[PDB]
Design a protein around this nucleic acid. Structure first.
Ligand SMILES: [Mg+2]
Ligand SMILES: [Mg+2]
Ligand SMILES: [Mg+2]
Ligand SMILES: [Mg+2]
Ligand SMILES: [Mg+2]
Ligand SMILES: [Mg+2]
Ligand SMILES: [Mg+2]
Ligand SMILES: [Mg+2]
Ligand SMILES: [Mg+2]
Ligand SMILES: [Mg+2]
Ligand SMILES: [Mg+2]
Ligand SMILES: [Mg+2]
Ligand SMILES: [Mg+2]
Ligand SMILES: [Mg+2]
Ligand SMILES: [Mg+2]
Ligand SMILES: [Mg+2]
Ligand SMILES: [Mg+2]
Ligand SMILES: [Mg+2]
Ligand SMILES: [Mg+2]
Ligand SMILES: [Mg+2]
Ligand SMILES: [Mg+2]
Ligand SMILES: [Mg+2]
Ligand SMILES: [Mg+2]
Ligand SMILES: [Mg+2]
Ligand SMILES: [Mg+2]
Ligand SMILES: [Mg+2]
Ligand SMILES: [Mg+2]
Ligand SMILES: [Mg+2]
Ligand SMILES: [Mg+2]
Ligand SMILES: [Mg+2]
Ligand SMILES: [Mg+2]
Ligand SMILES: [Mg+2]
Ligand SMILES: [Mg+2]
Ligand SMILES: [Mg+2]
Ligand SMILES: [Mg+2]
Ligand SMILES: [Mg+2]
Lengths: 51, 185, 52, 147, 103, 68
RNA sequence: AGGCUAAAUACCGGCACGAGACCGAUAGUCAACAAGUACCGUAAGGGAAAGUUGAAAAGAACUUUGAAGAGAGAGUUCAA
RNA sequence: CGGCUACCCACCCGACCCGUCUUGAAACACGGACCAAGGAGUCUAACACGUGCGCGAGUCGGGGGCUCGCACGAAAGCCGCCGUGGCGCAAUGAAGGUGAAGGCCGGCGCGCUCGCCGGCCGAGGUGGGAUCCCGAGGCCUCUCCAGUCCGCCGAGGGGCACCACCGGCCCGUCUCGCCCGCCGCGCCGGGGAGGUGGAGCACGAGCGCACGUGUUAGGACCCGAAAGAUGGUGAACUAUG
RNA sequence: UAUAGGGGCGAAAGACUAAUCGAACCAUCUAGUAGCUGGUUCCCUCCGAAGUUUCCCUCAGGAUAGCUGGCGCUCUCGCCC
RNA sequence: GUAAGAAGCCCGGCUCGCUGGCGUGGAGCCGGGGUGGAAUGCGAGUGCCUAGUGGGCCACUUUUGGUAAGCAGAACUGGC
């Protein structure tokens, strides 16, 4: 059958920078960049046009 | 003379359920509350006549908090009705409790802590007059039916959750819930 | 097939024996036990009928 | 049960529990939700506010699979894994933390609730709330983003 | 028509529905027919297993179910080519082939 | 078809059948309609009370207990 | 902008079968019986009522009254 | 001899003919000559409340599959890596989206209308609140001695549920200003203090089955129109060639 | 023998069209709808009204409030206050 | 219409970003002490669901239109 299997990843020691690795601000910045990707490109284009 | 509209007490004096064990518990606690002259026996006899709604299921964490209060070290917690397990707490004290129809998930969680539980007949055999006891009850108004009650969902201070077929947009939102369409409550 | 109160059933996966409400279903022994009658009230079997 | 219904005890009463002055006429007030805006406006505005009109913008061809995002709370974050994991973490043999993946249980977002145990955890989820993210780091845990 | 307080209802019984009502009084007979058909097919094809054609590993498309995996229709032509067996012989071997699926 | 227009006959009986009892008077009635500035000041005084209460009031309680 | 194909699906008509917490002759299909029959209207069409002797006819031989219908005796049946 | 009555008769008193529309019925208001049989609040779906049951932050196999062909079997039993799924466990915005823990103690930076740090339990406080606990005091053969023996209570304490208020947290808004971060230093993100709107949170109670009532859609308590549409039959009567 | 139903025919009465004509007959939709009449079946026990406010093309009706009943639930007496 | 107490009064101390000559005023909180506060009668509070009703009439008294009416229209109370 197609019974599901799952990777274990039992336990591990937390690294040093994991306390400040990710955050809610990371997802917020990712969403903001995905929303304002093309606008920044058009702004850079019209800025290089004036030069 | 005097009107006879309120002469008959509407309270019930006999359990509507046909459970044989509940009938025997009533027959025992009636004799106790009649003889021992204990107000605790009186109230625990009155709470056995109550229906399914008037006997709300008391959770486990609520009973933990009620027993953690000062003066409840060795006192026995008594819940007329079902006590249910709570998965939000992780550790539990001894918790020597007597209840009716304890849930199986809470059975092991209480028996692993070291405390022993007992039923109503064992409680009557141990302490007839109800000494060293704490009578607890679950949230009677915590039921969802009491959230649809009030004066009316139209008064500007309703907060009464009107009955709606499906919850979401364009379902009882436009005229009477915002100042843009008509009025605001 | 049904299991006991200690171990669940083997044939049925998530079934356990029903819970038992009154551990002692004999009212006579409970009412005649010394612990119950230790703190009882007087019988007071007087009728006190209507007096003319 | 016809023997338990009310119509049996109504035999002999001519009006059948409906009165002599106003008889039981076939839909005397209207059929269905008739006249929701007039001659029923009092009831419709007292018991169903907001029923008339449109509020929000329309979304053509909405799929309930896109907005599928179940939420899990911190008080339930330990009910997903087994019980022995919690005691093995509380034993504290070294600075190792158990990994609690909510995607296996079926939750995509973790929401914040208080009273966390003092054990460090490594959580893997697609979305995190700000309060939950600060509360898991105030105890010494770690948050891992997946996709 | 309305009462003191109650949920507003919109029953879809305004059409002439009583002349088209499907009662499932033949459900046990249908289940018995299906079971007898399964048994007869298995007895006729006894050396071959029931649901003979092997089905590949298939991930759910939508984001709601893309975390779990399920069965499918047939193996792709690329998978058949990497396996090294011909396309047309897999059908008589007992391997269901899905030419529309890509990798 | 002229009919009766408006009378208040047999109304006091209907009222007195159930009762015209006064509304429920309870302590801490409400804080609605009160001046918003006064309410803000009261909230500030309530939230800043425990800052200096638990020390000076405790000292004064110890002092009066020593007095009597 | 060309085509073929069984499967699970539906079936108040048709040919047979089984069953019923249904109806029991003003009920149940209109129709338990020579029922879509008698009958009605030019026609399209409308459309009924109507079961029970007795276990077995063993359906009352014979005498008398009456022209007969019918009746008095008698006779069969546990029972006319 | 005793006997009420479903037998008959007589006297005394009271006694208008039933059903419904109506403020008003015995009416010169309507229906009923009489008798026998039939005759009217049903069933389905959905909703709300209450009650009984089982389980319980879970609940439900009604949809399929399995065991052996079965009169009772169109039943019943089981699925366990069939819980897909429905309801509930999270709400708030039109939406992009966001999305609920308080309390005590000490210290520092101007303990500043002031943040952080360390330790603890961990869902705040007030006024009521069944019940429970402690409890001065006195209540049992001659006496100082006792554990049971007789046996209630002034006052005080922690306080179920629930009630009223204050404060706290979440989401959508308006005012005020300042701070922090950089997978990249921007009309990028995050945060505070105050006023309001929410069907919210502030140790959860729902699910499935049955019953009763009430509303509604189904012909829907029963009987009743003037009318509309579809498709066919009639100039053997009558009007006209 | 020809004209057949919103059609025919009419020296015109809206007369005739199979005893029916200011729109025939037959079957179906159709158990069409009715805020309008009539009826609505056994006993006992308990409680027991309103013809009033507001709104509606509302006035022979309905919604709302009020009157009523049922199910309860939370407490209080029962041993100088 | 209101009041005739313990949800009250006297005392001390804290908080305020409200106001401000003033430790001024006003609110909130804490702490210990003192219930017998007009008569009479009575057990109260509260939640849910809900049928019927939504044509009324009459009477003492006060009253509007009308000459008047067993006329039409109102207020309290009682009755059908
Ligand atoms: Mg009465
Ligand atoms: Mg009646
Ligand atoms: Mg009505
Ligand atoms: Mg009326
Ligand atoms: Mg009604
Ligand atoms: Mg229709
Ligand atoms: Mg009127
Ligand atoms: Mg093609
Ligand atoms: Mg084709
Ligand atoms: Mg086929
Ligand atoms: Mg039957
Ligand atoms: Mg017949
Ligand atoms: Mg002869
Ligand atoms: Mg009658
Ligand atoms: Mg009438
Ligand atoms: Mg009249
Ligand atoms: Mg009459
Ligand atoms: Mg009459
Ligand atoms: Mg007449
Ligand atoms: Mg007559
Ligand atoms: Mg009959
Ligand atoms: Mg699921
Ligand atoms: Mg009809
Ligand atoms: Mg029309
Ligand atoms: Mg035609
Ligand atoms: Mg001719
Ligand atoms: Mg026409
Ligand atoms: Mg004619
Ligand atoms: Mg016509
Ligand atoms: Mg009908
Ligand atoms: Mg009216
Ligand atoms: Mg009432
Ligand atoms: Mg009542
Ligand atoms: Mg009724
Ligand atoms: Mg009049
Ligand atoms: Mg008058």
């Amino acid at each position: 059958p197609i019974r599901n299997v799952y990777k274990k990843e039992k336990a591990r020691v937390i690294t040093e920078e994991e306390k400040n690795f990710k955050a809610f601000a990371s997802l917020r910045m990712a969403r903001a960049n995905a929303r304002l990707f093309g606008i920044r490109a058009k702004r850079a284009k019209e800025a290089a046009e004036q030069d | 003379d005097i009107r006879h509209n309120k002469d008959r007490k509407v309270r019930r004096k006999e359990p509507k359920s046909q459970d044989i064990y509940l009938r025997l518990l009533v027959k025992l606690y009636r004799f106790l509350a009649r003889r021992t002259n204990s107000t605790f026996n009186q109230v625990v006899l009155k709470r056995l006549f109550m229906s399914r709604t008037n006997r709300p299921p008391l959770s486990l964490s609520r009973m933990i908090r009620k027993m953690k209060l000062p003066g409840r070290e060795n006192k026995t917690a008594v819940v007329v009705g079902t006590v249910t397990d709570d998965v939000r707490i992780l550790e539990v004290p001894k918790l020597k409790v007597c209840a009716l129809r304890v849930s199986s998930r809470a059975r092991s969680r209480i028996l692993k802590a070291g405390g022993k539980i007992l039923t109503f007949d064992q409680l009557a055999l141990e302490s007839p007059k109800g000494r060293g006891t704490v009578l607890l009850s679950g949230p009677r108004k915590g039921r969802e039916v009491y959230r649809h009650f009030g004066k009316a969902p139209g008064t500007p201070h309703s907060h009464t959750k009107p009955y709606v077929r499906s919850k979401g947009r364009k379902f009882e939102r436009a005229r009477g819930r915002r100042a843009s369409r008509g009025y605001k409550n | 097939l049904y299991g006991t109160w200690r171990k669940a059933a083997s044939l049925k996966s998530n079934y356990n024996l029903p819970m038992h409400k009154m551990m002692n279903t004999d009212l006579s022994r409970i009412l005649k036990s010394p612990e119950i009658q230790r703190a009882l009230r007087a019988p007071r079997k007087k009728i006190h009928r209507r007096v003319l | 049960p016809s023997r338990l219904r009310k119509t049996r005890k109504l035999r002999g009463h001519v009006s059948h529990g409906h009165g002599r002055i106003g008889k039981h006429r076939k839909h005397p007030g209207g059929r269905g939700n008739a006249g929701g805006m007039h001659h029923h406006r009092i009831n419709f505005d007292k018991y169903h506010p907001g029923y008339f009109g449109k509020v929000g913008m329309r979304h053509y061809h909405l799929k309930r699979n896109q907005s599928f995002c179940p939420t899990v709370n911190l008080d339930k974050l330990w009910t997903l894994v087994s019980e022995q994991t919690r005691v093995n973490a509380a034993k504290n043999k070294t600075g190792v933390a158990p990994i609690i993946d909510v995607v296996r249980s079926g939750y995509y977002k973790v929401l914040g609730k208080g009273k966390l145990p003092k054990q460090p955890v490594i959580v893997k989820a697609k979305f995190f709330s700000r309060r939950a993210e600060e509360k898991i780091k105030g105890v010494g845990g770690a948050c891992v983003l997946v996709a | 028509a309305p009462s003191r307080n109650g949920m507003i209802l919109k029953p879809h019984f305004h059409k002439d529905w009583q002349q088209r009502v499907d009662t499932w009084f033949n459900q046990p007979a249908r289940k018995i027919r299906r079971r007898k058909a399964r048994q007869a097919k298995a007895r006729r094809i006894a050396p071959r297993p029931a649901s003979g054609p092997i089905r590949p590993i298939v991930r759910c498309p939508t984001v709601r179910y893309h975390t779990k995996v399920r069965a499918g229709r047939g193996f792709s032509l690329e998978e058949l080519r990497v396996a090294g067996i011909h396309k047309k012989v897999a059908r008589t071997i007992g391997i269901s082939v899905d030419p529309r699926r890509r990798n | 078809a002229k009919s009766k227009n408006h009378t208040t006959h047999n109304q006091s009986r209907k009222w007195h059948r159930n009762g015209i009892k006064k509304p429920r008077s309870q302590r801490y009635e409400s804080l609605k309609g009160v001046d918003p500035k006064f309410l803000r000041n009261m909230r500030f005084a309530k939230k800043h009370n425990k800052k200096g209460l638990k020390k000076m009031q405790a000292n004064n309680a110890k002092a009066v207990s020593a007095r009597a």
